């Protein structure tokens, strides 16, 4: 229940996608992202209908991350109609994400 984005398919799956899109700007060899990858799997499952969860590996898709000023990873970007509504960098929790999204939902 997780979306893989490239550079080409970032325009259609995210920028032209209606609804909240949560993008993980992650990489192959990084630490806090390897921990939250199981977290997004259950959140993508729970927020079915509401949220679309997507993952972008910036080692293979490295042209998109600079555009959105990715400072540290993992960087979560809540896209709302091509625009970035709220962003969070690093690891996180599910209850705190729930509070976060339902505040923006």
């Amino acid at each position: 229940k997780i979306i893989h984005l490239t550079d080409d398919s970032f325009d259609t799956d995210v920028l032209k996608a209606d609804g909240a899109i949560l993008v993980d700007f992650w990489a192959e060899w990084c630490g806090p992202c390897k921990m939250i990858a199981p977290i997004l799997d259950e959140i993508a499952d729970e927020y079915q209908g509401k949220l679309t969860v997507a993952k972008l590996n910036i080692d293979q898709n490295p042209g998109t991350a600079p555009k959105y000023g990715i400072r540290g990873i993992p960087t979560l970007l809540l896209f709302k109609n091509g625009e970035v509504a709220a962003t969070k960098v690093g690891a996180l929790s599910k209850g705190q994400l729930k509070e976060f999204l339902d505040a923006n939902l």
Binding site: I58, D59, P62, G63, A65
Partner: protein, 636 residues
């Protein structure tokens, strides 16, 4: 004989005022101090020693003191002051002549704690004061610390701005070190015989009763010092029109080489780049570089094959890119780039150290005039065009001077024929004159092509192993032994050459724990003028012998050529008829006002080259070849 050293306000290139100078007379055994209002009498005191036919002792005087006192006398006193080259002695040159093997010598000097780490092996006046125990301090430091307890600060090199009583005292300090260093050089009996106390002789006795190397080095240092002041005319606009073609190419290459690799930044000249790359494109390093990860390795890059066509095609873009940085880093962006060194006369005044080597082959730096890319190397054609006499005006007509480039025709192989004429009775020497010596070496060493003989003869003579030799035929260290031994059997004289000479410096040799503890007869090979030319290992040494002959040949060659040109009637400089612009080992670049003068320059150099061969009774025949033209790309 008098000993002196001076203190001015700045360097030779913008000095304006004479501060002080001290003159120790050996006949008076007493010093004399001079001050800014005593500059006039100072020049006369030097003229007086010239009238007696005595000697004047300076440290780096040939290159700085003498031309500065000529320059200062024109704007301050408006008088002409030219110390004759015969009546001048340079302790710095003798130090570079007598103590060329300082690098080892410093080991014991280090153990003492007497020699600074910043002044290791240096031939500066102060550096020798610690060696002889005469350094009560240094003017620059007795200035800085005393400026603290005065208030005001310090600017990089402000101690020479104004005449101060502390400079006058340390001006003496430079003089007493010159005297003691002179006597330290005169106490070497290999160069200065005991039968003559040179401290109290005329110039006529000094040069002839000293070793011949003493005379050449002072003639060499005087001439090359003139060459620096002449400088090399420079087309600034041309090099500027190259950085444009290169920076644009660098950025365009950088762009294509950033589409092939992402980031989180593609680096032009980083070692952490190829280390991160190619071993991700499918390349496993054949050869590494030391403690961790291979270096840039330009060599393997030609042979790197990766299954990724884009990565593979990008390799050649890296090859060009790195080279673009090289020219740029030499012509623009370098700290010692050419554009930074162009003087306000439209010339590059590249410095040159006379005997800055064991053999006597000179060294060039600031900027290294002797490493300008060749016309065969990419963009070297344009580079060589930037260095030309045509890039100079003219004192009268303004019509660009013509350049004359004369090189020593195959000096290395003829030098080999000379030392081996002692064993073959002029056999190999005639093969040079008869021609196609590389053809004979090809037959002697059993090589397939003549070009393979060319790369063989130089590598073998200079101590190459078997890899470079093996890679000639597409092999490794294996192929080499039979190629070297076969050449030895077909050319006995070369083998016999290393027999008597290499066994002239040993009694018996011995291996101790992997180190050869050779019992030496003398740890120094005699040059063509009796100087000491040390080596290291007796396993070859021949390379040192041949390069010593060649460098000593050209040194005398460029001296006599100028001497004959002056004798024939030509005046040296941009205001006369010709000007030395650059000396590069076996080739020289001479500026000439008219084509007629250049033709004489070419002929004279050949006449001087035959004169050198007759002088040292060279067993082989020396020839030279000249090229007339506007610049350096033409003269070679």
């Amino acid at each position: 004989m008098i000993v002196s050293a001076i203190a001015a306000n700045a360097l030779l290139e913008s000095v304006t005022k004479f501060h002080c100078g001290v003159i120790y007379d050996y006949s008076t055994a007493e010093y004399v101090s001079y001050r800014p209002s005593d500059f006039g009498a100072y020049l006369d005191a030097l003229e007086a020693e010239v009238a007696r036919g005595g000697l004047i002792v300076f440290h780096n005087g040939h290159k700085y003191d003498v031309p500065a006192l000529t320059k200062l006398a024109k704007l301050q006193l408006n008088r002409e002051f030219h110390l004759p080259r015969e009546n001048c002695i340079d302790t710095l040159v003798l130090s570079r002549l007598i103590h060329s093997n300082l690098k080892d010598t410093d080991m014991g000097l280090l153990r003492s704690g007497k020699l600074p780490g910043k002044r290791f092996g240096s031939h500066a006046l102060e550096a020798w004061g610690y060696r002889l125990g005469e350094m009560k301090g240094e003017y620059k430091d007795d200035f800085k610390r005393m400026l603290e307890e005065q208030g005001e600060e310090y600017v990089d090199g402000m101690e020479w701005w104004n005449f101060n009583e502390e400079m006058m005292d340390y001006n003496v300090q430079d003089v007493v070190v010159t005297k003691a260093l002179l006597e330290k050089l005169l106490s070497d009996k290999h160069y200065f015989p005991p039968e003559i106390d040179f401290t109290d002789v005329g110039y006529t006795t000094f040069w002839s009763e000293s070793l011949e190397a003493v005379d050449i080095e002072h003639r060499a240092a005087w001439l090359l010092a003139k060459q620096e002041r002449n400088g090399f005319p420079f087309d600034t606009k041309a090099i500027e029109e190259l950085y444009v073609e290169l920076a644009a190419r660098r950025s365009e290459l950088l762009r294509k080489l950033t589409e092939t690799f992402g980031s989180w930044v593609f680096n032009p000249s980083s070692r952490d780049h190829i280390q991160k790359k190619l071993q991700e494109a499918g390349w496993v390093p054949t050869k590494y570089t030391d403690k961790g990860a291979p270096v840039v390795d330009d060599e393997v890059l030609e042979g790197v094959r990766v299954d990724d066509p884009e990565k593979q095609a990008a390799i050649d873009l890296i090859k060009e890119y790195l080279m673009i940085q090289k020219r740029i880093g030499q012509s623009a962006e370098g700290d010692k780039a050419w554009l930074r060194y162009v003087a306000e006369d439209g010339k590059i005044h590249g410095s040159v150290n006379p005997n800055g080597a064991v053999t006597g082959r000179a060294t060039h730096a600031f900027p290294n005039l002797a490493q300008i890319p060749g016309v065969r190397s990419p963009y070297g054609e344009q580079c060589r065009a930037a260095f030309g006499a045509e890039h100079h005006l003219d004192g009268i007509t303004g019509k660009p001077w013509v350049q004359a480039g004369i090189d020593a025709s195959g000096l290395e192989l003829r030098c080999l024929a000379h030392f081996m004429a002692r064993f073959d009775n002029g056999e190999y020497a005639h093969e040079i004159l008869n021609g196609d010596i590389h053809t004979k070496n090809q037959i002697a060493a059993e090589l397939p092509t003549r070009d393979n003989a060319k790369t063989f003869i130089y590598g073998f003579l200079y101590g190459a192993g078997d890899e470079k030799i093996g890679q000639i035929v597409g092999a490794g260290k294996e192929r080499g032994k039979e190629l070297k031994k076969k050449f030895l059997e077909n050319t006995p004289a070369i083998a016999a050459l290393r027999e008597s000479i290499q066994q002239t410096l040993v009694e018996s040799s011995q291996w101790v724990a992997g180190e050869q503890q050779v019992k030496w007869k003398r740890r120094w090979i005699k040059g063509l003028d009796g100087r000491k030319v040390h080596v290291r290992s007796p396993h070859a040494a021949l390379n040192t012998l041949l390069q010593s002959a060649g460098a000593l040949i050209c040194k005398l060659w460029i001296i006599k050529t100028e001497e004959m040109l002056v004798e024939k009637g030509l005046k040296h400089g941009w205001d006369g008829d010709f000007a030395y612009m650059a000396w590069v080992h076996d080739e020289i670049q001479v500026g000439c006002r008219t084509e007629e003068i250049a033709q004489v320059v070419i002929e004279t150099a050949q006449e001087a080259m035959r004169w050198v061969g007759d002088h040292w009774n060279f067993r082989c025949l020396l020839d030279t070849e000249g090229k007339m033209g506007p610049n350096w790309a033409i003269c070679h």
